[PDB]
Each structure stands twice: as C-alpha cells, then as structure tokens.
C-alpha cells in the first residue's frame, strides 16, 4: 500500500547522495 | 474400518509444535489403496488365530526408514499375539519387532534416563529409567508369550 509519486525531478539529488556516499 | 477421533492425536501426540519425532511424522498420513489391502490381511490373521500367521515384507526403503520402523515396533507389541496357546506372528516377524522396539527405546536419551545393559547383548536387554524398569520381558518367547497380548 506504499506508493511513490510519478513527479520526482530529484534525479540530481539522488545522484548527489550516491556520489556523496562514494 | 473406522478411524479414531482426530482430537485424540491432536491433544496428546502433537500437543506441542516445535518438536517432531517418530510418532508425529507418521500421524499426518493416510494410507494408499495398496496399504488398505494390507490392513485387510491383518484382520484376516486375527480372526483365524493359529491357522493364518503373517510375516513382514522384504522390500527396502521401509526397512531403512527409521520413523516407520520405530512406530511399528511399539504398536506391534500391543496388537498381536505370540502367546502360549496360539500365535499370529511368525518366528521371524517377532524378532524384527524386537530390534524395532530396541531402537525406539534408546534412539534418544539424555542424562535423565540412565540405561544399564545386561550380560548377553540381545535386543531389549537393559534396565531403563529412574525406577529401573527391566525391559527383558518384551523380547518374544513363544513358550510363554511374554511381550504380546497373551
């Protein structure tokens, strides 16, 4: 019953966190 | 052929989950059409007592299975008669129901039930338990019939 939204333009922030983790 | 009530095994043979054994595995099974025909041979040997004796089958798979072989020994002493007047078991069959009971009584024991063996080294030749019950009487002796219904 969980759901994400189809409108997420966080593709810079989700690229930043795994680049910060790297 | 009437089965017993299923609340007889369910309150005392599988009363606790998280522990299995030789009885708890066998009780969840119902026999095939070629095993009803063997129960139909037990109840022919018991009706003609001395006239029709019976014997165990050769085949492997069951003779290596330690859950069928251990529950058949305990049952087979309550059901048949190797007594002093007639007999339903053969000379050979009552020997295999003695190695079977010998395995069941000591396949698992902790340091609470001490076992004191006897001199001969035969099946069922020990004294088990704290009260030291002498298990020699359940070895089949056809002259007196000391282990069975007679």
């Amino acid at each position: 019953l969980l759901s994400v939204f189809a409108l997420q333009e966080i593709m810079q922030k989700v690229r930043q966190v795994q680049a910060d983790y790297m | 052929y009437i089965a017993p009530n299923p609340r007889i095994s369910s309150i005392t043979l599988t009363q606790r989950i998280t522990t299995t054994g030789p009885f708890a595995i066998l009780t969840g099974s119902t026999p095939t059409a070629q095993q009803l025909n063997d129960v139909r041979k037990i109840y022919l040997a018991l009706m003609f007592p001395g006239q029709i004796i019976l014997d165990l089958k050769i085949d492997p798979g069951e003779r290596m299975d330690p859950a069928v072989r251990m529950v058949a020994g305990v049952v087979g002493h309550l059901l048949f008669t190797a007594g002093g007047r007639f007999t339903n078991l053969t000379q050979n069959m009552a020997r295999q129901l003695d190695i079977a009971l010998n395995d069941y009584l000591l396949y698992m024991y902790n340091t609470r039930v001490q076992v004191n063996y006897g001199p001969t080294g035969e099946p069922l030749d020990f004294q088990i338990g704290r009260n030291q019950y002498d298990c020699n009487v359940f070895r089949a002796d056809f002259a007196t019939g000391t282990g069975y219904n007679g």
Binding site: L1, L2, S3, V4, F5, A6, L7, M11, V14, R15, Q18 | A3, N5, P6, R7, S9, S10, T14, I17, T18, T20, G28, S29, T30, T32, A33, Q34, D59
Partner: protein
C-alpha cells in the same frame, strides 16, 4: 548508439514506408488511423441498401490523401511495386526460377508440389485442384503479415549497407509482376490469388528467411571482429555458402532441402575427428556415463589415438554415399533449372572431411559449424500431400531359423513382463474395477455391444489425422475410437507413470530395466544445455567410442507381427496375478484383446486422402454414364468422381491427361497392422523394440569378435539408440569386421539401417537433436519466426509476446544476434493488435459502436499502431517488458525505478522514460458424468436440491467442478464458435475499458496483504560492497553474443539444484503428477482455498476440505501433512508473484541457487522463508545486470541502518504484508502464530 534510440528510428521508418502519409511521433504511446476496402461495401449492396459514393472516396485518398474523418487521417497500404522503391537487379537466381516452371503436367499424387504456372481462364478441373492444394499446402499463417516483412528488410538493408539475395530475387518480382497474393491483414489465413505461379508464398517465405540468415551472420562477424569464417586451414566466406545453396533449392525447395539436409548434418558431425592433435574441453562428472553433475576445466590439447582408424573401409564407403547424396540432389536440379553451376565452395570441404582439424576455442570454427546446422530452415513447415498405402504384408519377413525374428520376439516378451514387475516396486499397479470409470478423465463410451463391434468394414471404420512439423515432411497421427482405447488405458497405465521420472542408471550388466529406457515430455523441462550435459562430457573423453544407429522408415519394419505377438504374449502372462477379479462382469484377459483385438489394431480400415489418376475426357463420359454415384465417400473439389477402382484403373494412363478421376466407395482404402502413434503405448512399445534389438546387438558382437567393443551404457528414446562403448583396438581390418557384424544383426531382424545414417565416431555425439562436439556445444535452431504450425489467434496479447520472447531467448542462446533479436521484437510489437477493433471512434469523446449513417459505415475498422518501445515498458502498466541491455532480465516495476538511477543506463533508457504511463490497455480476453466422477462429486450431485444449491448461488469458492465441467463443455465448443462468440463480447468491453482509461500518476511498488512480489526488496537499501574473484568460469556453450557471453563468464554454469522453488510450488509437484489435477488447478488455485479458511478445529475437518474441490481424495494426504507442517514449521503466509528466471538461458546460469546466496547476498536474519526468496529473486536480476553492463563484480548487500524513523517505516510495512486487518475477520485465522508474533520484536 543505443538500441532504444537507433532501433526505434528504423521501426518508425518501416511505418513511414508502409503507410506512407503518416506523421509519427515517438513520445506518443500509440497513434490511431483507419482504412477500409470495398469487399464489405458490395455485400450490403446485394441486400437492397445502395450506397452514395461507390469508389469516389477511394479516389479521394489514394495519393492526394486530402480527406480525413473526425480529424483522424485515412491512409492506404502500399502497393507491391513500391516495397523495394522500384529497384531492379541482375538476379541470376531469378532467371533460374522462371525457367523452372511448368503448367498442367504434374503428378497429382506427389509429396511436395512443384512449380505450376497460373494461366487465367483455364479449366476448373485441374486448376481448381491446384488451387485446392496450395490453399492447404502453402500457408504462411502466424502473427505478422508477410507484406510488412518484405518492407522491413527494405528498411533494414539500407542501414547496414548490405543487400540480401532474398530481396534481389524479390525486387525483380515487383517490376514485371503486379501482385503475388492478397493476404487479408485481419485473419492472415486467406490467400485467394496467385498471379503467375502457384508456389508464390513459398517463394517469399524462403526469401524472408534467407535475408535474416545473412544479417545474422554479418552482424555476428563484427562482434567477433573477424573478417570471414575459417575452415581448418583456408578462408571461407559464409554468405557464399548460402548463395550456392539458395540457387539449388530454388527449382523445388521442399524436395531439394529434404535430401540435401542429410550431407549437411553429416558434415558437422565428422569434422574434427581425424586430426592428430585434438583440442577438447576437459570435463569431470560421476562414474556413470549418464551423470549430469559435470564440472568443467580449461581447454587443452591431446594426441589422437584413432588417427590410423579412419583409413578403414567403413568411412570410405560412408563418404562416397554422402558425396552421392550431394550429386543426386544436384542432378535433379541441373535439368529442371537452366543453371549449370552448383555448390562450388562446399564441395571442396567434403573431399577431406575427417583429417582437417576443428578447434572450438577460436570463434572462427564455431560460427561455421553452427551456420551449417541453421542453413536448412529457409523452407520451414514442409506441408506435404500423403497417400493412403496399405500393409502389403507379402514383404513382411516371416520368422526363420536363419533369421533373428523369433529371438527378437522372445526377448521383447521378457521386457514388458519386466516393466510390470519393476513398476510394482514403485507402487505403480493396474487400475482397479472400483475406479474404472473415475480414471477415464485422463484423456480429454463403454457398452457391451459397442465393445464387441468391429471396425474392418466400409460402413464403420477409423479415420486418420495429420499434423505438421518444423522442417520435416508432414507426419501422420492416428485417431483411435475412444471405446477401444480405454482397454488400453487400464493395462498400460503402470508403464506411462513408471517411465515418467527423469533419473536413471544406464549399465548393461545392471539388472533393472527402467533406467535404460526414457520417454521425455512435450517441452524440455529445464534448459537444453543443462540437461544434455551427459552428451558433452563423452565427446571430451579420450576413451569413449559411441555408436548411434538410425532406423529409416521404422514403422514399415515395425509393421511385422513379431513385435505384435511377443508384446501380447507378455501382457497376458503378466496379468496372471490379476486373474480372479472381473472388469464389469468379465475377466481382465478378455478385455486386453478388446484394446488389442482383431478389429482394433490387427486389421482396421482407415480413410485418408484418396488415390487418383489423370486421364482424358472423351473416354470418361463414355464410362461415367453408369456410375455417377456419390454420398458414400467424398471427392476433392478438382476431381471428377466414379464408383470403383476397377473402373478407374482400366482408363488410367493418357498422353494428354486432361481430367482427373476418383473412386468413392469401391476403393478398399487401407488396412494397417503397425503400432499407432495415437495409442497409450506408442513411445513405450517402440522404445522397447529398440531394447530387444539392441540387446541382440551386443550378443553377436560378443560372439563373433569377442574382447573388442565392451558396452558401458544403453540409452533408448523414440526412434533412436545410443551406445556409449569403448573400442579396444585401433585396427583397420578388425574394426572393419566388428562394424560389419552390427549391420548384419539389424538386417537379420528385418530393419534396414543405412551405413550413412549409422554413427561410429569417438569425438562426436548427437542425441535428440542436441549436437555435442569435442566437449563443447554446437547448436542448431530449427525454430522459426515467420511461419507457424497452425493459424495462431492472439487472444492474450499481454501473454502472447511474453511467450514469444521466450522463443527469442532460445534463438540468441543458439547464436542469433542479440540486437537483431531486439529489432525483431521491436518490429513485432506494433503490428499485432492493429486489426482487432470493430468500429471507428472519435478522439477525446465516446466510442461509436453503432453508426446508422452512410459515411462512417464505409470506414469499418480502426488501426492501432503502438510505439516500438512498448517492448521495454514493464508489466502491470498495460505493456509487456523486456530489458534493453539484456533480453533474459525481466523488466518489472521495481526494475524501472532502479534502472534510471544507474549512470550507464541514462543514455540507453533516455527515450524509455517518456513513454511510461502513456500506452493504451491490452487485449486480454478471459449424463456421462454421473459415472465418471469421484464419490466426492457423486454425493454432491445426487444431493437434495435444497442442500446442493447453497454451494452455487450464495457461497463457496468452487474453482474446479461442475461449472468447470461446463467450462470443459465450453472448451470442446471452443475451437470455432465459443472463441468467436465471446470475441463479439470482449470488443464491446474493450471500447469501454479504453475510453475509461486515464494515464495515472503515482506508480506504486507494493502488493496486497496475502501475497508479495519481487518488489519487496525496495523496503531496504542495497550497498554494492565487498570484492569477489574475477576468475572467468569455463562453459561448453560457445557462440553467444557479448550481451550473453559476459553473463556466463562472470557467473558460471550451475552445479546444483535450485532452491527458489518454494514450498507453495512443492505442493504443485503433487498437483503436477495427476493429469486430472495438472491441467485444471495449481498453487494459485489451492492457496485461495486456504485463504477462505485457515486454523480449523480438527485435521479430520482438514483432509475433507479438498474433497470439496471435487477432484481427488488421495492427494488430500499431502494437504493434510503440509498444513500440519506449516502449523509446526514457520512460514510467511503469503504467496510469491513473479515472472522471472524461467527462460532456458537463466536456468543454465548459477543464479537463484543456494550457492548463489553464499557469495552474492548478505541479508538480515529477521527474514522469513518466502521473504528471502523475494530478496534473492531481486538479487538474481541485479547481478545479471551487473555483469551485462561491465560493472565490477561485487557482493550485493541489503542494509538496515540505525535511523530510528526509518526503522519505524519498515516495521509498519512488514506488518501489513503479513497479517491483514479487515480480512482477519473474514478468514478467522488466529494471530497466535509464531512467525507473526515475532513482528513486535524484529527491528524495534
């Protein structure tokens, strides 16, 4: 550079050429147009209602395209002159074709029909018969029209800058001739015209296959970065090997290819066997010769021991028979075609075939060996006229002292007798008189007069059947009456179940009989590389000499009575322990000759296609005035009828041969005494006939040449034997005498095994069309993509192309190009449901069903052109999904949220991201029994109606049973009308279910309470950490694309049995055995009954709940113990939804096994048994994607941090997928289960 950006431009360009005036946008889900033809316009003219403009609107939209209805453009299909842009070539193959044509001079009984010329205004007695044959023989039914296939190669040849010869001979067919046929795009089964030749669709189907076979090679040759192939010393061009082949078949391609496939298959078997240093792939497995648990080592070379053995006279005689078989196919085509040239590249290889080496480690020898196996599949689905011929038992060999016929017949009596005893030990017995009627449902009747009636009459008889095959000619199938097959059901039942197991030990000195014979199933369970590993390791061994003989026309020498009597002698003597009990009044020895009697299989009349002679017309009417009869038996539509053969043979031969003839009643068609393919003992008996022959093989070798050729294994399958032996001398004279005594044993049994078919080689194995060569895997692919077996109806288009991509996983696994296998599906994703709509619509409004107007009653149906990138949008979002970077990875909705977060997929999946939630939905369509039913059913059917009805209207799940019997009654009217009648109902449903479709935002990654999917792994994170060995694993199957070679390199072939088959599917194994349970109900059916009630009060209330399913009573035991087991053992109560890891390349890899977790998985211990499967099935796709990208091999680890808010969201979401809130008051399951009680204390 990506397949999604470059390949989608091509499939758009195909639509830009096919419907030429179409503006197409890629970011739209699917564009809609419509078009119509006046075949239906003329029909309602005849009913009285004339139309306004007959062909004025057709003039309006041919080339100006200036009219459009409701804003929707109206575009025409392209003509045939423009599909190759009006190009022309020299095409020496085409002028060979046109001189190889002949009118009105063919033999009317013939196997594969030759080139007939079509002359208009010709007769209606020959030409209607030729049009009758080509309507049945030459049909290209399937899923795609053949017209757009010819446009697809025209667009594909331009991008690769390479012209195929199949288009060159087609581009000359468009400028001189207008239109070959008129295939209706709605049904694809109607070809109602042939313009110059009757064999025009065979001309195209062998050309639309010819073009792909050299696009497959030329793409693959750059993937191996080599210029051309390499026979053992010299350079060889592969396209010239096919152009030398395509010219030779082109006179008569179904006949030429059937006789030229034998030296092409024989050449690849005996290639690298005679060279002195031999390179093998060293394998290691069990001590038995049939053990499948194999372990592979690196490549090595070894000196050949059999170097001087190929100087023998066995191979020198066998080679000139194959060089003859080249030449007889040549001489048949040197005269019928004008060509004086043939096969110049292949003929230089066959002269020195043995001594030239073959190394598998170089790719330039594995592509060439695979290519010659895949040559023969251009003329697919050979559909052939067969004639009705009788037994002619004067040629049947009588038992003799000088012959082995009686010794064969007494050997096979002791084998049916032995199979009955060894089935008694596996609890397979005869059926009882009690369950005689219940056991009759295994097939889809019994009367004492209907069982005593015969069939050797003209009035009542048996009727044959026929079904097709991929490359071979059409083999027959026998249809036996169901009255006399039930006596074969009762006595062959403990033989069908006994040889159904897969495991077995094949030793000759072993006493048992079940391991040495084996009958497989319909589909190959598992892979093909995985379960044929016993064939690989014996071509890698220096001391195994395998013998595999072949029986040509096996039934003509099975026709003899020696296997008929000797089988029935062993049936009677083994029913002697069952001699007291009577089957419905009479004994068992009386009923075995009711299924094997005289009027059952010994002498029965069979009716097939009739005999027919080509005669004159003037002498026909002078005799047909007395015998004009019909009504007894029917005559084909071209043929003129007479009464008897005896009036038909007196006028038989004519120099003119004008009119045909056919005897209806006085024919006495066919009487057969041969083991039928339709009986319950088809594959059981004839494989035992190979056992009785093969045991006589080892005796005469041991008694004439003793000490040589010890036998180590015996594998008997359908029409094949396979002896794994070893030879004890490398002698030229002694081996020539041992190989002579093998043929003298078969010939003295009655059969005629050819010396060119018999295989006696050390380093090559073929077994059931799996070629193993020198320790590696040389694959063939006879499966095809254009034609089909029967006409295919697309009823579940969500599930059809999901099933079609399975047969494209196998193609690239045999060496087809991976990206060419992507372009085929991207072409085949737009042209499926284009003509499945009834009436036209107006956009952004309601969907018009009824019209009642003269304008829109001309524009009948619509066109729906989906986007070519609908292949990659995942399932559950109204479109089927396959991953672009790898075909074996199932694109799912949790994979879509992962594949966009990887930097190496931002270029490939850039145009994928804009078409998600844009696509339209899927065409997803969805008396006797009082005796043949279990007493669970008879008591429930003979109930008082006041008690029987409450299981029907108010309550009860009841997925199988009487309504499924009505569904079984709906399955037997399914084939013509019930498929068509509900097709009128789903279309009225689909227009409402498309107009109410809103492309919905906020995709969700989750499931219901009582189930879980692979998307469960998105509760946790995943950290790629650790480091593993970069050791490249060794594997036998070479010849793969780099998208598949690198998955097998980083992850080896599997070595154990997979564990991911959960215990929900362990009870499917119980329901797989019973065929009254296999085809009807399964784990998803049986868990919904557990969903209706769990935690009852007694186990006696438990065994009985599946008798309420009214199928069986014995397998309620396995549902008694396992529910008691899950009451004892922990379980996550939910099911597992998946569609992954099922294709036969994934089963070969070492993924989804217990040894895959221990290196590639690290999970928290607070996870149940069906939750760790949902992690592992997620983990399999991640590592296969990690290898098919070039990412470094790491250890995938799911992590749970110490963030106390994120620990709360997991305990909130693990809870609702375990125990449902509202549905606890529906099931009344107890919450005091041990597993659901841990959830308070798991993560806290």
């Amino acid at each position: 550079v990506a397949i999604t950006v470059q390949g989608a431009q091509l499939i758009k360009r195909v639509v830009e050429r096919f419907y030429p005036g179409i503006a197409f946008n890629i970011n739209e889900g699917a564009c809609y147009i419509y078009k119509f033809s006046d075949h239906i316009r003329r029909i309602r003219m005849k009913h009285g209602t004339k139309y306004r403009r007959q062909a004025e609107e057709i003039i309006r939209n041919i080339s100006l395209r200036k009219e459009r209805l409701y804003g929707i453009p109206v575009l025409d299909e392209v003509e045939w002159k423009y599909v190759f842009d009006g190009q022309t070539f020299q095409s020496y193959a085409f002028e060979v074709y046109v001189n190889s044509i002949l009118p009105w001079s063919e033999l009317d009984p013939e196997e594969e029909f030759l080139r007939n010329y079509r002359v208009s205004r010709e007769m209606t007695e020959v030409e209607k018969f030729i049009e009758f044959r080509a309507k049945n023989e030459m049909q290209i039914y399937g899923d795609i029209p053949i017209k757009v296939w010819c446009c697809f190669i025209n667009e594909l040849s331009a991008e690769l800058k390479h012209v195929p010869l199949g288009m060159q001979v087609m581009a000359d067919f468009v400028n001189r001739f207008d239109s070959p046929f008129h295939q209706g795009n709605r049904d694809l089964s109607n070809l109602e015209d042939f313009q110059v030749a009757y064999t025009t669709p065979l001309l195209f189907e062998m050309c639309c296959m010819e073009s792909i076979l050299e696009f497959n090679i030329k793409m693959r040759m750059r993937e191996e970065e080599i210029s051309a192939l390499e026979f053992g010393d010299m350079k060889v061009d592969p396209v010239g090997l096919l152009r030398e082949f395509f010219i030779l078949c082109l006179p008569h391609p179904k006949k030429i290819n059937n006789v030229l496939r034998a030296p092409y298959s024989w050449f690849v078997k005996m290639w690298g066997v005679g060279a002195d240093p031999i390179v093998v792939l060293q394998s290691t497995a069990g001590d038995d010769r049939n053990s499948k648990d194999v372990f592979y080592d690196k490549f090595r070379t070894e000196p050949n021991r059999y170097k001087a053995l190929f100087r023998s006279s066995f191979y020198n005689e066998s080679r000139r028979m194959n060089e003859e078989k080249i030449l007889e196919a040549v001489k048949y085509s040197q005269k019928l075609g004008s060509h004086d040239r043939r096969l110049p590249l292949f003929e230089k290889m066959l002269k020195t075939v043995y001594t030239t080496p073959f190394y598998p480690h170089k790719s330039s020898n594995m592509i060439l060996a695979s290519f010659l196996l895949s040559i023969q599949t251009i003329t697919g689905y050979g559909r052939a006229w067969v004639k009705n011929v009788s037994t002619e038992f004067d040629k049947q060999l009588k038992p003799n002292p000088s012959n082995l016929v009686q010794d064969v017949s007494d050997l096979t009596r002791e084998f049916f007798k032995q199979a009955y005893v060894e089935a008694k030990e596996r609890r397979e017995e005869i059926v009882k008189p009690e369950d005689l009627y219940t056991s009759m449902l295994r097939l889809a009747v019994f009367t004492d007069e209907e069982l005593h009636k015969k069939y050797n009459s003209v009035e009542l008889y048996q009727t044959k059947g026929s079904r097709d095959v991929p490359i071979k000619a059409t083999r027959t199938i026998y249809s036996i009456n169901l009255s006399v097959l039930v006596p074969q059901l009762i006595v062959t039942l403990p033989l069908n179940e006994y040889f159904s197991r897969v495991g077995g030990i094949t030793s000759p000195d072993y006493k048992k009989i079940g391991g040495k014979v084996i009958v497989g199933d319909l589909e190959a369970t598992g892979s093909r590389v995985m379960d044929a590993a016993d064939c690989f390791r014996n071509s890698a061994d220096r001391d195994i000499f395998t013998i595999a003989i072949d029986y040509s026309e096996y039934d003509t020498h099975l026709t003899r009575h020696n296997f008929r009597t000797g089988m029935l002698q062993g049936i009677r003597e083994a029913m002697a322990p069952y001699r007291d009990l009577r089957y419905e009044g009479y004994t068992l020895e009386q009923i075995i000759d009711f299924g094997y009697g005289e009027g059952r299989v010994a002498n029965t009349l069979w009716n097939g296609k009739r005999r027919l002679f080509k005669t004159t017309f003037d002498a026909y009417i002078r005799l047909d005035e007395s015998e004009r009869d019909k009504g007894s038996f029917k005559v084909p539509k071209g043929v003129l009828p007479v009464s008897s053969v005896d009036v038909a043979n007196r006028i038989a031969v004519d120099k003119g041969f004008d009119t045909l003839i056919a005897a209806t009643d006085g024919s006495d068609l066919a009487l057969i005494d041969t083991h039928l393919s339709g009986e319950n003992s088809t594959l059981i008996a004839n494989s035992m006939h190979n056992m009785a022959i093969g045991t006589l093989m080892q005796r005469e070798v041991g008694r004439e040449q003793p000490g040589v050729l010890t036998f180590l294994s015996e594998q008997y399958v359908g029409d094949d034997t396979l002896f794994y032996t070893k030879l004890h001398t490398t002698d030229t004279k002694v081996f020539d005498k041992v190989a002579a005594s093998i043929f003298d044993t078969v010939a003295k049994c009655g059969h005629e095994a050819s010396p060119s078919k018999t295989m006696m080689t050390p380093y090559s194995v073929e077994k059931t069309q799996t070629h193993a060569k020198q320790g590696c895997y040389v694959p063939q692919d006879r499966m095809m993509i254009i034609s089909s077996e029967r006409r295919k109806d697309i009823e579940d288009v969500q599930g059809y192309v999901r099933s079609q991509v399975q047969t494209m996983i196998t193609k690239v696994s045999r060496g087809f190009c991976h990206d060419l296998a992507q372009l085929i599906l991207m072409l085949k994703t737009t042209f499926i449901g284009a003509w499945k709509m009834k009436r036209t619509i107006k956009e952004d409004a309601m969907y018009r069903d009824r019209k009642f107007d003269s304008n829109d009653e001309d524009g009948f149906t619509l066109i729906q052109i989906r986007n070519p990138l609908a292949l990659y949008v995942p399932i559950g979002w109204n479109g089927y999904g396959a991953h672009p970077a790898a075909l074996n990875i199932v694109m799912t909705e949790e994979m879509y949220v992962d594949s966009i977060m990887i930097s190496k997929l931002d270029e490939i999946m850039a145009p994928i991201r804009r078409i998600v939630h844009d696509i339209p939905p899927c065409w997803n369509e969805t008396s006797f029994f009082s005796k043949m039913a279990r007493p669970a059913v008879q008591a429930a059917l003979s109930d008082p109606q006041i008690i029987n009805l409450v299981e029907e209207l108010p309550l009860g799940e009841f997925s199988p049973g009487r309504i499924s019997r009505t569904m079984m009654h709906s399955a037997l009217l399914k084939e013509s009308s019930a498929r068509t009648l509900l097709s009128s109902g789903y279309e009225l449903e689909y227009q409402k279910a498309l107009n109410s479709w809103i492309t919905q935002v906020s995709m969700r990654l989750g499931e219901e309470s009582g189930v879980i999917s692979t998307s469960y792994a998105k509760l946790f994170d995943v950290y790629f950490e650790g480091e593993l060995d970069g050791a490249p694993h060794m594997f036998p199957d070479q010849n793969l694309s780099p998208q598949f070679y690198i998955q097998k390199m980083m992850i080896g072939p599997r070595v154990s049995s997979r564990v991911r088959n959960s215990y929900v599917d362990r009870i499917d194994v119980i329901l797989r055995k019973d065929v009254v349970m296999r085809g009807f109900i399964t784990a998803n059916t049986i868990l919904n009954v557990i969903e209706k009630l769990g935690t009852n009060h007694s186990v006696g209330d438990l065994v009985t709940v599946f008798t309420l399913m009214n199928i069986e009573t014995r397998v309620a035991e396995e549902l008694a113990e396992y529910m008691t087991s899950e009451k004892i053992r922990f379980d996550a109560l939910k099911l597992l939804k998946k569609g992954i890891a099922g294709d036969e390349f994934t089963m070969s890899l070492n993924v989804a096994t217990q040894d895959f977790i221990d290196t590639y998985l690290a999970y928290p211990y607070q996870l149940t048994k069906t939750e760790v499967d949902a992690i592992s099935l997620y983990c399999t796709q991640m590592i296969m994607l990690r290898a098919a990208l070039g990412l470094p091999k790491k250890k995938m680890k799911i992590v749970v941090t110490d963030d106390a808010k994120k620990r709360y969201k997991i305990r909130l979401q693990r809870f609702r997928t375990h125990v449902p809130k509202i549905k606890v008051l529906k099931k009344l399951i107890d919450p005091n289960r041990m597993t659901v009680r841990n959830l308070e204390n798991q993560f806290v």
